[PDB]
Design a protein around this ligand. Structure first.
Ligand code: CLA
Ligand code: CLA
Ligand code: CLA
Ligand code: CLA
Ligand code: CLA
Ligand code: CLA
Ligand code: CLA
Ligand code: CLA
Ligand code: CLA
Ligand SMILES: CCCCCCCCCCCCCCCC(=O)OC[C@H](COP(=O)(O)OC[C@@H](O)CO)OC(=O)CCCCCCCCCCCCCCC
Lengths: 139, 75, 146, 80, 143, 40, 741, 40
């Protein structure tokens, strides 16, 4: 499964709701060298332990916001945070980072999908592709 | 129907001095920092108090005496 | 503007007092006083602390329009994110209430979209705008003449 | 879900990737620019259409465009 | 000492322990309500809930309703309560029809189509019973 | 002073100066010759 | 031998940076590339926190700017004094105050505005003023124009002194940061040296100057036969024959035989039957007691002799079981963040101004004020608007603090953290109470309207129908009326006749009479409660959710003032705290408008009026409030329509300037809707076309024009909207109240 | 309420149906239809 040792937090009302155990939730794990204080994206501040920490949140944006805070708002930076999606059936899908290297930097083994080979000004006219169920970008 | 007050008399002086001495007794045990600030020449006679402590307890004594004297005059 | 002009001119024509419009239509205070303030007297007295006459429905609809027109300003002025945050708080409140978690929604409540907000505000605005003037016109002309 | 498309005017400046808060973009090797890299959007199912990526793009008009479409729980950013 | 802590041992859930969220008295009072009690059939649950919810609805129309002045006052309250309970049963039945029409489970017998339908029927009959007993108490003579 | 002259030549100060000049022109012309509906 | 610590000549006094606008900001210093650079210049000016990161530098800037605002206020005050000395009929009004209207503005005749110089009685022609300055001056013992002129000169001199003080204490000798963080010493000096000493000096002035002059004036002495104020000092016998106790001297004060002073230090209460104001001896004992209390209180916090409490100790020592760390950590919050201090002070001062407005009409202090209805209404509305604006600013700058100065590391399990941790509960319960109040309260009005419309008056919520009696306020009024009897034995009359008692009337006009409370008053007070809770909901949600929210989890990185996070998540318009303030401004306007309408109509209908010599009272609107103010149609017909006859018909008289202004108010309001209802993309495209037009003729500007930003558009809309509405209400109230008395 | 027009009893039943019965029925059916899962 996953690791443990949740950060020392008093809890709040801004945390998980029913969807967490009915649709999906998210997990973020990271190893910190000191037992310090960070800001919970759900309101309030929590103490993260010295060693490994695991935290459950409701949205991927919250996990990535906490990752940004970890990476930027600490003098000894954190680079080993991992974000998984936890399905209600216990199946865990490892989301971020995808290949282990940060997406901001070029790395081999990527597929280059979503790329058009034309300029944005060379898109086909809407009238020509009428009754095709596709917008100009879709072709 | 204004409350009746008291013209100056030795009994009023005694009440004021008693209130002042009770105030100094209160400050002898209630004040946290006492030997602080500008000191007094013969500190022993004031229980090790400083100038600020002496002034504070004396002002508190006059305040307490004023309250007690007015309340007593309005018996 | 068009209908105000037509109505004032024809009120003067029907009453015979064309001089009123001929004099007081050259400055805006005349429009405010001799047309809006002056003719409203019969309308707003449709129902009184002393009684009620046949213009009561028109006074009620007049206030109804003055209300819907103002209601449109919520959607025209305030925008979505505020209401989405408020709805999130309400959702939290409903989910944590005993005896109310038994009943749960099927479609997740959300705030109205931006374009939907503009459309709804404009609709409330237009309905109030039409109803207010319709009530005023009918009531004034019916009380004065009918 | 929303559709994120990258056109051939990208200069491999990586601003769009960093500006994305939901980790939808990525840097892939390329040859059409000096930087020899281009932007890709492999995880568009996680894009919320916040348009920060477009706001970060420095090219004339936009080398990266976001078209909003069908709304799911992820793309609507719902926590409930 | 600290009367406020995590909700049921997991802080990360969107709730907090309060002297009214998980106190012993709170759980005891809530857990023994007809909608939350143990070992109660859905039909009987509905009967018990409807009895009270229709009993208390007799009030406002009897004292504030348009017929409060006339002798047709408690009757007006009764009619209002009966109409309200009827519409309530219609809404309950609609909710049951639209909610549990997919997969069916028996972990909770209230959260199933047949269970919810029985709850609605018992709620109807309890509403009638409570409204009528309230009318019988309030209304003078008429016997 | 260089900075003083530069500040005096900034946009708001200059537009205020021109506006007050024109206002004075109009005020004086209307004090000496009031009620000019047209040129007869 | 003082805690002072300053730096010498930190900022040179040079003129060059005056010629480089935008110098303070790094971005603006690059000159203008688009028109937005101009707007950012005027907006980023007095925000020093973003300009520099040195807290000491920010503090020095704030200190100097506060000197500047003091200089501006002093210039304004000297202007009022001069314009009352030279261009007023104060000496004329002082002779027959019940027959001469106050007037201190005179209009040059240029294009026919000389019609504005209306007849105020006694052969004087000028604008009637409603600020109540004449009554304040008479209450200060003013009798000559030369004294007012000297006061104006002194105000000018003080303004110059404050300006020089700002220049010195910034550009030459600037205090260090540790000097500012002497919150204990600051509180001591400002509680004792500023408030207590000020009130003591004012009480001395009242006793030694104002009270004898007013006593002589009320007896019929001509305003020129009264001696100059210093004559009561140079000849103490006259003071001793006005008050016998002055013969006794200062001995009873030091012997604590204070009873003999009771001839001029009274506890009368009520109002002066001749001037319609409070007894000046009451204000003397009042300001004296206030001075004594503040002087005592200023000796609380320890500064340099160990005697006294310590704020940090009290803050860390007040904590309970429900609150974890409790009040700990707040001392560093309030001694390192200017915005938190600004928020607290703004909220408290706004509430204080509201209290001033609410208490200043029921106990009219100044002579002949309650008899002047226009002044009462103007002062009430003015200070209430000031209070509302201050409270909204409190909310705004609290949100600013939360975004900027908050640090999670220093607030672990303190009160602030636990606030941030049950905020959903707070907002949910407050939202529910807002909905409940709105529904029940306003639906009462709608229900009454419908019942009246249908010919069902017995089903209404009226006093002759289903009644909603505010029995609690009635009980408290009954109690406060009985206070002179036993609960406050040494008081002669009630604190105010608003609670109950006799009717006090000066000349023929009622000064103050009991203000009963019924069904309509119940509904209006609960409407006030509803509007206030809603405004609090908006501002509190803005403050609590500023850092982040479920929708946007990193709102803090976007700043306090940002328009949106984009059309994503279904649309994220107006999520910042700034937008919360922008939305709260409208609700503050709505609440205060309802409050001032309530005050105006209730006063006109139940209090103000005239008195027949028999003893009967005829009110201005013949007591129609108790039956018409229970429906919206009543507030439309009997208040907005009926009472607007005095303003629309103002053309051709001296009140025309109000009528004009009234229409002006009705215009700008509508104008603001151009900015609230639209968006900047349309205007950007229109500007593109217009720029093409100016480009065709080679006349395009170098500074490329741009449509206003989203935040700027919202700000412009709200500003012009508030201006239009408030100007409308001001013109309406002034024109109405200058036509009834 | 009553009137002198022919068939005065028709409003007595028609108006409640168009005011209560018809709206209740149509909103119930619409709510049922708009929530039926699948068959998109
Ligand atoms: C020990 C001897 C003694 C005696 C016999 C009296 C006797 C008297 N004193 Mg007195 N006094 C004394 C000592 C004494 N005093 C001392 C030592 C002090 C100084 C601390 C005072 C200070 C003092 C003051 C300042 C006053 C009196 C007054 C009085 C008289 C009325 C008191 C009363 O209950 O009415 C009052 C009864 C009430 C029910 C009123 C209390 C309700 C108030 C309004 C609540 C206020 C709310 C408050 C602001 C909120 C709390 C803030 C803060 C404390 C947290 C009474 C003759 C009063 C007087 O002379 O009146 C003519 C008066 O004003 N005394
Ligand atoms: C006349 C115009 C108008 C009206 C009615 C409202 C009404 C409301 N606003 Mg709003 N608003 C307006 C203008 C208006 N606003 C404008 C111009 C702005 C721009 C600044 C805003 C900005 C604004 C904000 C920022 C907020 C509100 C909030 C609220 C709610 C407050 C809760 C309340 O009053 O109880 C509920 C509403 C009422 C009692 C309204 C009266 C309804 C009648 C009396 C009952 C009708 C009976 C029944 C429904 C009939 C059924 C008929 C059948 C055919 C269905 C409420 C929905 C707050 C909110 O979310 O709620 C707490 C909030 O945060 N508004
Ligand atoms: C608009 C609100 C409203 C109104 C007008 C009424 C009106 C009434 N309620 Mg009532 N009620 C309400 C809300 C309301 N209720 C709510 C919200 C609850 C809680 C769910 C109740 C619970 C309640 C109970 C439990 C009882 C009433 C009873 C009554 C009736 C007698 C008056 C009374 O208090 O007993 C005065 C006392 C007596 C008449 C002695 C009888 C023994 C009266 C018609 C009583 C009733 O109908 O029985 C006679 C009764 O027993 N009410
Ligand atoms: C026909 C002769 C005449 C006379 C007797 C006056 C007299 C006056 N003018 Mg004046 N004025 C005149 C012609 C005249 N003006 C003309 C032809 C112009 C157009 C340039 C002006 C433009 C003018 C302005 C702009 C102002 C005056 C002001 C004044 C008053 C202040 C004293 C003054 O002139 O210094 C002040 C003079 C100036 C500030 C500008 C004078 C420019 C000269 C005339 C060129 C005084 C009553 C001032 C005033 O009333 O204060 C509010 C004021 O602000 N006048
Ligand atoms: C007797 C002591 C004393 C007094 C009266 C004041 C008074 C004031 N301080 Mg202050 N202060 C003091 C001690 C004092 N301070 C100490 C010891 C410190 C160090 C901790 C500070 C640090 C401090 C800061 C950091 C700031 C102030 C500010 C202010 C002003 C607040 C604005 C206001 O309320 O308008 C009320 C205005 C008036 C009542 C008009 C008074 C005009 C002058 C300044 C008063 C001079 C009176 C003086 C005693 C001479 C009178 C003698 C004789 C004529 C009777 C106010 C004038 C603020 C400021 O900058 O304002 C300029 C501010 O930000 N104070
Ligand atoms: C700061 C305020 C202030 C100031 C400067 C003065 C100043 C003065 N008072 Mg005064 N006084 C004040 C407040 C003040 N008073 C108050 C609050 C009271 C009420 C208790 C009095 C009651 C009072 C009396 C009863 C008398 C004076 C007198 C005097 C004069 C001589 C006393 C003196 O200065 O010897 C140091 C002097 C002009 C005496 C005088 O000359 O009468 C005019 C006198 O008989 N005062
Ligand atoms: C003691 C009072 C006080 C003080 C010292 C400050 C200080 C500050 N505020 Mg604050 N504020 C206050 C009261 C106060 N505020 C109140 C009462 C409100 C509620 C409306 C606000 C709302 C507020 C917001 C929303 C913001 C600030 C900001 C700021 C910062 C500087 C930027 C700024 O506003 O300057 C520049 C100010 C202007 C350019 C305003 C000029 C334009 C005004 C609106 C026109 C007024 C017209 C006038 C009323 C009538 C003229 C009519 C016309 C025909 C001539 C600064 C820390 C800003 C910030 O975040 O900085 C950190 C910010 O965004 N404040
Ligand atoms: C669209 C035309 C129209 C409209 C607006 C009305 C309006 C009205 N009719 Mg009426 N009526 C109509 C046509 C219409 N009638 C026709 C053609 C007939 C002959 C069968 C009748 C026979 C009739 C009777 C016998 C009575 C009314 C009554 C009434 C009033 C009660 C409300 C009501 O409609 O329910 C009752 C009305 C009906 C059930 C009529 C059926 C509807 C007609 C036949 C077709 C309407 C279809 C329409 C186009 C659908 C548009 C959908 C759109 C909203 C999206 C109301 C003023 C009552 C009345 O006067 O009370 C005082 C009453 O007793 N109507
Ligand atoms: C669509 C058309 C329509 C019709 C025909 C009615 C008809 C009626 N309404 Mg009504 N109402 C409507 C729409 C309508 N409503 C809407 C849209 C609203 C929301 C604003 C309301 C809100 C409303 C309220 C708040 C109340 C009524 C009441 C009533 C009844 C008062 C008559 C009487 O004497 O009471 C006595 C009538 C009887 C004893 C006969 C009862 C007949 C059946 C069985 C009742 C079910 C009457 C049956 C009153 C009521 O409940 O009275 C009981 C009442 O208090 N109405
Ligand atoms: C009197 C006028 C009519 C009003 C009657 C209505 C009363 C209804 C509620 C009771 C108020 C009790 C407050 C006690 C509460 C109190 O004593 O706090 C006690 C507790 C703090 O106790 P400690 O001793 O731990 O405090 C340590 C402190 O020194 C700070 O660290 O605070 C909390 O638990 C906060 C939770 C409040 C959560 C409930 C908030 C209710 C908000 C609504 C208030 C409604 C009434 C508003 C009237 C203006």
């Amino acid at each position: 499964e996953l690791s443990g040792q949740p950060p020392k937090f008093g809890g709040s009302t801004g945390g998980l709701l029913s969807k967490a155990n009915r649709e999906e939730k998210y997990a973020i794990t990271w190893t910190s060298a000191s037992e310090q204080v960070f800001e919970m994206p759900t309101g309030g501040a929590a103490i993260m332990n010295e060693g490994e920490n695991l935290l459950y949140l409701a949205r991927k944006e919250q996990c990535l916001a906490l990752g940004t805070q970890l990476r930027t708002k600490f003098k000894p930076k954190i680079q080993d945070y991992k974000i998984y999606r936890v399905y209600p059936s216990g199946e865990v899908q490892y989301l971020h980072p995808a290949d282990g290297v940060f997406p901001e930097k070029v790395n081999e083994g990527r597929e280059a999908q979503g790329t058009k080979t034309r300029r944005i000004g060379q898109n086909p006219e809407p009238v020509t592709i009428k009754f095709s169920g596709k917008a100009p970008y879709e072709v | 129907a204004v409350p009746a007050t008291l013209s100056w008399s030795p009994k009023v002086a005694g009440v004021m001095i008693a209130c002042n001495i009770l105030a100094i007794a209160f400050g002898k045990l209630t004040i946290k920092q006492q030997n602080v600030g500008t000191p007094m020449p013969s500190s022993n006679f004031f229980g090790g108090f400083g100038l600020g402590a002496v002034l504070g307890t004396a002002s508190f004594g006059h305040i307490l005496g004023a309250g007690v004297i007015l309340g007593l005059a309005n018996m | 503007w068009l209908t105000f002009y037509w109505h004032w001119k024809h009120l003067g024509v029907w009453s015979g007092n064309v001089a009123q419009f001929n004099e007081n239509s050259t400055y805006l205070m005349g429009w405010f006083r001799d047309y809006l303030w002056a003719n409203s007297a019969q309308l707003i007295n449709g129902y009184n602390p002393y009684g009620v006459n046949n213009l009561s429905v028109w006074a009620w609809m007049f206030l109804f329009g003055h209300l819907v027109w103002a209601t449109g300003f919520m959607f025209l002025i305030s925008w979505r994110g505020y209401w989405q945050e408020l709805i999130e708080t309400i959702v939290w409140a409903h989910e944590r209430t005993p005896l109310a978690n038994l009943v749960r929604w099927k479609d997740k409540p959300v705030a109205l979209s931006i374009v939907q907000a503009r459309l709804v505000g404009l609709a409330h605005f237009t309905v109030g705008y039409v109803l207010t003037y319709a009530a005023f016109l009918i009531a004034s002309t019916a009380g004065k003449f009918g | 879900s929303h559709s994120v498309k990258i056109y051939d005017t990208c200069i491999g400046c990586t601003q769009c990737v960093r500006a994305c808060p939901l980790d939808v973009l990525e840097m892939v090797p390329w040859d059409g620019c000096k930087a020899a890299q281009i932007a890709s959007s492999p995880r568009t199912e996680d894009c919320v259409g916040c348009k920060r990526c477009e706001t970060a793009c420095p090219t004339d008009f936009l080398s990266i465009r976001v078209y909003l479409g069908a709304e799911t729980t992820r793309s609507m950013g719902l926590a409930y | 000492n600290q009367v406020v802590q995590a909700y049921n041992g997991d802080p990360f859930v969107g709730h907090l322990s309060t002297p009214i969220s998980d106190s012993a008295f709170t759980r005891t009072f809530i857990g023994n309500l007809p909608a939350y009690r143990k070992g109660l059939s859905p039909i009987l649950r509905g009967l018990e809930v409807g009895m009270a919810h229709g009993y208390f609805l007799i009030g406002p129309w009897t004292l504030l309703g348009p017929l409060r002045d006339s002798e047709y006052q408690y009757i007006g309250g009764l009619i209002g309560a009966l109409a309200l309970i009827l519409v309530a049963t219609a809404a309950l039945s609609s909710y049951g029809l639209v909610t549990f029409q997919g997969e069916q489970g028996s972990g909770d017998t209230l959260q199933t189509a047949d269970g919810w339908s029985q709850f609605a029927a018992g709620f109807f009959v309890g509403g009638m019973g409570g409204a009528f007993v309230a009318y019988f108490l309030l209304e003078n003579l008429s016997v | 002073m260089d900075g003083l002259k530069s500040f005096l030549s900034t946009a708001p100060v200059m537009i205020m100066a021109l506006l007050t000049f024109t206002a004075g022109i109009l005020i004086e012309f209307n004090r000496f010759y009031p009620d000019l509906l047209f040129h007869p | 031998k003082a805690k002072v610590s300053v730096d010498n000549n930190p900022v040179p006094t040079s003129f060059e940076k005056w010629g480089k606008p935008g110098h303070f900001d790094r971005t603006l210093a690059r000159g203008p590339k688009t028109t937005t650079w101009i707007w950012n210049l005027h907006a980023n000016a007095h925000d020093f926190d973003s300009q520099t990161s040195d807290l000491e530098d920010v503090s020095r800037k704030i200190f100097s700017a506060h000197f500047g605002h003091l200089a501006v206020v002093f210039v304004w005050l000297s202007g009022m004094y001069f314009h009352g000395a030279k261009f007023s009929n104060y000496e004329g009004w002082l002779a027959d105050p019940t027959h001469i209207k106050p007037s201190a503005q005179v209009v040059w005749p240029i294009v026919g505005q000389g019609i504005l110089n209306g007849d105020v009685g006694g052969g004087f022609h000028g604008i009637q003023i409603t600020s109540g300055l004449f009554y304040l001056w008479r209450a200060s013992g003013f009798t000559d124009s030369y004294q007012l002129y000297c006061t104006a000169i002194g105000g000018l001199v003080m303004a110059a002194l404050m300006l020089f003080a700002g220049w010195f204490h910034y550009h030459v000798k600037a205090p260090k940061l540790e000097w500012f963080q002497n919150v204990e010493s600051m509180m001591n000096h400002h509680l004792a040296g500023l408030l207590g000493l000020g009130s003591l000096g004012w009480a001395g002035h009242q006793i030694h100057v104002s009270m004898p002059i007013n006593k002589l004036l009320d007896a019929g002495v001509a305003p020129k036969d009264i001696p100059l104020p210093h004559e009561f000092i140079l000849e103490p016998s006259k003071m001793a024959e006005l008050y016998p106790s002055f013969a006794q001297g200062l001995t009873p004060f030091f012997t604590l035989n204070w009873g003999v002073y009771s001839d001029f230090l009274t506890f009368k209460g009520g109002l002066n039957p001749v001037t319609g104001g409070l007894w000046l001896s009451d204000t003397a004992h009042h300001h004296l007691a206030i001075a004594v209390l503040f002087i005592i209180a200023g000796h609380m916090y320890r500064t340099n002799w160990g005697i006294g409490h310590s704020m940090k100790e009290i803050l860390e020592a007040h904590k309970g079981p429900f609150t974890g760390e409790g009040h700990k950590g707040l001392y560093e919050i309030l001694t390192t963040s200017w915005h938190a201090q600004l928020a607290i002070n703004l909220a408290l001062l706004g509430s204080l101004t509201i209290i001033v407005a609410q208490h200043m009409y029921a106990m009219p202090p100044y002579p002949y004020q309650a008899i002047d209805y226009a002044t009462q209404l103007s002062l009430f509305t003015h200070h209430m608007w000031i209070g509302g604006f201050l409270i909204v600013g409190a909310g705004a700058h609290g949100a600013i603090f939360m975004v900027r100065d908050y640090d999670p590391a220093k607030n672990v399990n303190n009160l602030l953290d636990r606030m941030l941790r049950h905020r959903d509960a707070i907002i949910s319960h407050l939202n529910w109470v807002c909905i409940f109040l709105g529904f029940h309260s306003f639906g009462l009005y709608i229900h009454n309207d419908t019942m009246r419309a249908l010919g069902r008056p017995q089903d209404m919520f009226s006093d002759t129908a289903i009644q909603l009696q505010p029995i609690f306020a009635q009980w408290v009024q009954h109690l406060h009326t009985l206070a002179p009897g036993a609960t406050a034995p040494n008081a002669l009359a009630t604190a105010s006749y608003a609670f109950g008692g006799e009717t006090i009337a000066v000349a023929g006009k009622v000064a103050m009479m009991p203000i009963t409370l019924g069904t309509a008053d119940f509904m209006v007070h609960h409407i006030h409660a509803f509007t206030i809770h809603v405004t609090a909901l908006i501002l509190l949600k803005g403050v609590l959710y500023a850092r982040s929210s479920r929708l946007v989890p990193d709102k803090a990185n976007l700043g306090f003032r940002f328009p949106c996070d984009g059309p994503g998540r279904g649309g994220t318009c107006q999520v910042s705290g700034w937008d919360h303030v922008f939305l709260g401004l409208f609700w503050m306007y709505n609440s205060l408008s309802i409050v001032i309408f309530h005050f105006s109509w209730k006063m006109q209908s139940d209090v103000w009026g005239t008195v027949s010599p028999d003893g009967s009272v005829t009110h201005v609107t013949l007591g129609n409030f108790a039956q018409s103010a229970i429906t919206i149609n009543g507030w439309l017909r009997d208040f907005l329509w009926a009472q607007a006859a005095n303003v629309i018909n103002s053309y051709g008289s001296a009140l025309s300037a109000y009528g004009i202004m009234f229409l002006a108010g009705h215009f700008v309001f509508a104008f603001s809707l151009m900015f609230l209802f639209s968006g900047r993309g349309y205007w950007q495209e229109l500007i593109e076309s217009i720029v093409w037009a100016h480009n065709k003729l080679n006349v395009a500007p170098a500074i490329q024009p741009r449509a206003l930003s989203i935040i700027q558009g919202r700000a412009v809309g709200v500003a012009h909207y508030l201006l239009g509405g408030i100007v409308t209400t001001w013109a309406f109230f002034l024109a109405r109240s200058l036509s009834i008395g | 309420m009553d009137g002198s027009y022919a068939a005065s009893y028709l409003p007595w039943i028609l108006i409640p149906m168009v005011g209560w019965l018809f709206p209740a029925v149509t909103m119930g059916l619409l709510f049922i239809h708009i929530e039926s899962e699948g068959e998109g």
